[PDB]
Amino acid sequence: PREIITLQLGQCGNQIGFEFWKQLCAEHGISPEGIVEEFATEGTDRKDVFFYQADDEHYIPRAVLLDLEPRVIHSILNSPYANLYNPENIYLSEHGGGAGNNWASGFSQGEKIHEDIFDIIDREADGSDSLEGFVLCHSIAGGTGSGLGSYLLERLNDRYPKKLVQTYSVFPNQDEMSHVVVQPYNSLLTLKRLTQNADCVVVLDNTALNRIATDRLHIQNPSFSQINQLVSTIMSASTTTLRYPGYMNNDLIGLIASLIPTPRLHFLMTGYTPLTTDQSVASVRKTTVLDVMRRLLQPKNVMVSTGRDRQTNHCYIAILNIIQGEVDPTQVHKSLQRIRERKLANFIPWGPASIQVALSRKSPYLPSAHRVSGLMMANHTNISSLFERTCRQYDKLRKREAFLEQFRKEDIFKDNFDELDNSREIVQQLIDEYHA
Amino acid sequence: ILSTGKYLNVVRECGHDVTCPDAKEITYTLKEQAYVERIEKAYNYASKVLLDFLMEEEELVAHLRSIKHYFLMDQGDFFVHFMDLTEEELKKPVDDIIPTRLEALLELALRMSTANTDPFKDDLKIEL
């Protein structure tokens, strides 16, 4: 019916998808090894849209996880949520990889394991006779997720041409350049494949993570154990129309169709306010829907590093405001009434704009059926500031003679560096041209 | 006695529950001016059980609190949020798609400034 195959790949893409499947059992009322609660069918009306359909009421995840590093998968099998995963769909015990840290490693390893990489991931494709598409849950940081992920964006474009492609990709961190220095090279090589060899992306910045991780979360030493908490909730938040029973844009080709203006303009800004557990003691007094979307357009919950004074000459075109759970829908048109009076979104002068609001009932659970949740999927034309940030860090590195002799020994014979530079400037010029 | 029948018909509109305070009402006695004074202490009691019915279910005091000084303007944080949206729209007379947005902005300005009792503020309608 609407079966999606997630493509978890890389050192960071496997960990953000590990707790994504772990989030799904707590809201479906199911255990990874059994069914102890009856809340799975009376409370939740649809479960076989991301999981594989049941053979013994065991909803297998439709997931594949490949990585060169064996460290990310050795921290999985000792956890009690790995018995839900199957040891025959992806790998058996003692799976390995390369050495290995290179973008050209996984780019060259795709055609030497070409027979095996297109054998076991295609067995899940013909399980349903109407496949939705493929989401590449991969990474941009490092050479593991960026090297091999650029290969599958090409060969799955023609072997599966009538399928939706759209990824929840995480952006790397640009604070210092000591541990990694190959960061401007492997990022722009995948970013070219994300626009012409891929339809849509969902950007997730790393410098904007610790802006939120010290905002309300109150940590002193930033660890990697907090990167899975902001990411796994908004992943399950994006499929609330798709997993839980909704009516309009209840498919993944429903939501993405109403937000993309044009190809190579698909970078969607994400926002999510409620992350604090001591808000729970004051949501008993009928906290309404009239105050939760006034702060979405206000740049506080954003996960995109952008300029603060560059929003006057930029214009919103498509903005999504997803409320979940208890909505009190007699005032949801009242919340959309107050949008035109502030004009917090700058509107495009050539065409109409749209503020789309939708709702779906959440899990039968006490932290879910009590507190209001707001998921934002914006589309603003100030996203070229990240593309100006990455390009200015790209041409400055090529004048310092950095990784021009250390990178072209394997499988690179011609200069494909300006092939990425002009196509990035094509994106940056067509964005500003789009508001005439 | 006219106003007696007006208050007993108000409680009768809710339900059939009142009884005259005596078991038998007699006026065929030489005293008659002390019997219309026990008629006046009767409609005073009918006022008191109407004042009862105001204070229990209806909340007349909370209704006058939610209207009047708030209608002059008491808590302007409800209204200065709405006055942000009177400067973008209210430049020309109303079109056919404008009053659909004005109720959407009143209900938006309800919960951004945290109303304490929502069924006392959904009774606001918008003049064309």
Side-chain angles (χ1 to χ4, degrees):
Chain A
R2 295 298 149 204
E3 305 315 289
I4 321 185
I5 307 300
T6 173
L7 251 70
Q8 294 157 246
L9 215 155
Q11 45 177 351
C12 290
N14 288 153
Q15 274 179 77
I16 65 175
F18 163 69
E19 287 184 14
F20 160 69
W21 289 111
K22 196 183 69 182
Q23 172 58 233
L24 270 155
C25 12
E27 55 183 350
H28 277 308
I30 59 170
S31 172
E33 93 296 311
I35 310 294
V36 324
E37 289 296 327
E38 53 72 28
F39 289 147
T41 144
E42 283 99 314
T44 302
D45 270 331
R46 166 159 189 83
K47 293 172 289 187
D48 37 9
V49 73
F50 262 110
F51 291 107
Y52 181 62
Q53 323 199 357
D55 12 270
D56 59 282
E57 315 215 351
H58 202 304
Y59 298 108
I60 316 188
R62 291 168 162 268
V64 283
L65 280 86
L66 275 300
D67 195 21
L68 274 78
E69 306 172 36
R71 187 234 66 91
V72 283
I73 61 173
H74 289 166
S75 188
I76 287 176
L77 74 159
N78 326 70
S79 135
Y81 295 92
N83 47 8
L84 156 80
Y85 292 91
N86 289 8
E88 79 281 349
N89 292 344
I90 316 163
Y91 48 84
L92 320 71
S93 227
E94 199 59 72
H95 192 244
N101 187 267
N102 220 342
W103 181 88
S105 50
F107 196 63
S108 62
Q109 278 195 45
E111 306 82 1
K112 67 180 220 187
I113 326 170
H114 170 73
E115 171 150 1
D116 203 78
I117 204 179
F118 284 161
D119 199 58
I120 202 60
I121 73 167
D122 277 352
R123 198 190 64 84
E124 217 64 49
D126 48 47
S128 152
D129 298 321
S130 56
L131 191 71
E132 177 85 1
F134 296 122
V135 47
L136 285 87
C137 225
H138 73 93
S139 208
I140 310 296
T144 49
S146 185
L148 198 145
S150 305
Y151 174 63
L152 296 155
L153 286 164
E154 300 169 310
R155 292 307 300 169
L156 297 167
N157 206 357
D158 49 355
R159 290 173 72 255
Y160 292 93
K162 277 161 176 114
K163 283 65 176 190
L164 175 71
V165 84
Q166 173 218 348
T167 171
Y168 305 96
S169 277
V170 285
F171 277 170
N173 171 260
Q174 284 169 333
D175 284 340
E176 311 92 305
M177 204 73 100
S178 59
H179 168 213
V180 95
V181 74
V182 74
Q183 191 184 348
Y185 279 108
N186 48 19
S187 54
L188 201 52
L189 271 158
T190 318
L191 275 186
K192 188 196 181 61
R193 311 299 199 273
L194 281 184
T195 72
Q196 48 184 82
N197 280 327
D199 163 70
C200 189
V201 306
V202 175
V203 299
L204 284 164
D205 206 84
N206 221 340
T207 48
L209 273 157
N210 322 311
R211 187 179 288 182
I212 310 173
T214 80
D215 207 302
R216 296 143 78 198
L217 256 172
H218 301 93
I219 62 169
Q220 235 39 34
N221 169 277
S223 56
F224 196 72
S225 54
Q226 282 62 249
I227 211 168
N228 348 61
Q229 288 159 6
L230 204 123
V231 163
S232 49
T233 72
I234 58 171
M235 278 162 89
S236 75
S238 50
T239 172
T240 52
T241 52
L242 174 74
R243 163 191 58 236
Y244 296 135
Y247 182 44
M248 284 303 182
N249 297 322
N250 74 280
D251 299 332
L252 204 81
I253 53 159
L255 297 159
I256 306 303
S258 195
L259 300 167
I260 287 189
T262 198
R264 90 176 46 99
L265 181 51
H266 48 85
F267 320 98
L268 301 161
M269 271 176 64
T270 317
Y272 199 84
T273 60
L275 297 157
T276 305
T277 54
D278 342 86
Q279 195 267 356
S280 50
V281 304
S283 62
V284 286
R285 58 167 190 87
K286 174 48 189 143
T287 315
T288 183
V289 76
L290 294 172
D291 70 319
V292 296
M293 67 164 66
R294 304 182 309 175
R295 68 181 72 101
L296 302 184
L297 253 55
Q298 174 175 14
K300 187 64 214 86
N301 54 359
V302 301
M303 335 180 172
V304 159
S305 28
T306 171
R308 282 309 167 256
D309 52 39
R310 315 185 74 254
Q311 292 195 37
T312 149
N313 319 337
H314 293 129
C315 296
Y316 284 84
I317 175 162
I319 169 69
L320 209 75
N321 303 82
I322 298 302
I323 198 89
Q324 329 204 354
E326 195 268 322
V327 24
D328 200 35
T330 190
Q331 323 188 89
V332 64
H333 81 104
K334 194 155 186 49
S335 294
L336 189 67
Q337 175 68 293
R338 315 162 74 188
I339 299 297
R340 56 181 181 179
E341 305 301 320
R342 298 296 178 188
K343 319 153 181 147
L344 273 147
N346 284 327
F347 312 110
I348 39 170
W350 61 275
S354 65
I355 308 106
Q356 274 192 16
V357 47
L359 55 97
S360 49
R361 47 189 72 100
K362 277 191 76 69
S363 162
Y365 196 32
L366 169 146
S368 72
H370 213 121
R371 285 92 204 175
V372 282
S373 206
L375 176 80
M376 190 172 56
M377 208 93 81
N379 202 358
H380 197 35
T381 58
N382 63 339
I383 47 179
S384 293
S385 58
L386 279 163
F387 301 136
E388 281 184 273
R389 186 180 183 182
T390 46
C391 179
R392 279 176 297 186
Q393 288 180 261
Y394 183 71
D395 56 358
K396 194 163 74 186
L397 193 72
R398 79 187 306 167
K399 304 178 217 204
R400 282 177 287 199
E401 285 306 315
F403 275 5
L404 286 156
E405 176 46 11
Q406 284 69 18
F407 198 52
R408 292 178 50 195
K409 316 187 281 284
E410 284 81 44
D411 84 346
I412 294 178
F413 307 139
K414 61 181 199 282
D415 299 336
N416 44 287
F417 310 121
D418 304 52
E419 268 86 344
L420 321 168
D421 210 34
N422 188 351
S423 57
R424 186 84 277 168
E425 292 279 71
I426 280 172
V427 172
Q428 293 178 45
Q429 284 318 294
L430 286 184
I431 278 171
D432 291 331
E433 180 172 1
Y434 210 73
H435 56 278
Chain B
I1 60 189
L2 186 75
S3 55
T4 309
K6 289 186 177 179
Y7 286 176
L8 69 94
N9 200 255
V10 167
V11 193
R12 199 269 295 158
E13 188 264 337
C14 178
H16 53 112
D17 51 324
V18 70
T19 315
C20 298
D22 45 9
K24 165 63 187 167
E25 201 274 321
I26 298 176
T27 311
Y28 44 96
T29 289
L30 170 56
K31 291 296 115 180
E32 298 107 359
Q33 75 294 333
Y35 284 159
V36 288
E37 84 187 348
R38 65 160 177 93
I39 283 163
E40 64 185 26
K41 79 177 271 316
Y43 81 66
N44 288 1
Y45 181 81
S47 193
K48 279 148 62 68
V49 306
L50 191 166
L51 283 151
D52 185 303
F53 184 74
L54 294 175
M55 290 306 279
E56 59 187 347
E57 299 297 323
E58 298 205 326
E59 310 310 288
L60 164 66
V61 181
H63 282 330
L64 192 44
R65 197 269 302 153
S66 51
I67 299 163
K68 179 257 297 150
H69 43 63
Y70 181 80
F71 211 76
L72 274 292
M73 265 171 209
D74 188 24
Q75 308 278 69
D77 54 298
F78 296 79
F79 288 97
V80 300
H81 285 197
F82 185 77
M83 193 182 48
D84 190 20
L85 298 144
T86 201
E87 297 294 324
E88 308 161 19
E89 174 51 55
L90 206 69
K91 199 67 67 65
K92 191 258 172 189
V94 287
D95 301 0
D96 57 284
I97 67 171
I98 299 309
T100 47
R101 302 192 63 114
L102 299 181
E103 42 186 52
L105 290 167
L106 184 53
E107 299 165 310
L108 178 72
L110 199 146
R111 308 203 151 73
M112 188 61 73
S113 83
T114 77
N116 64 309
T117 309
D118 72 84
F120 290 168
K121 294 190 184 65
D122 46 17
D123 311 292
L124 293 171
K125 79 176 184 193
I126 294 96
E127 183 46 59
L128 185 67

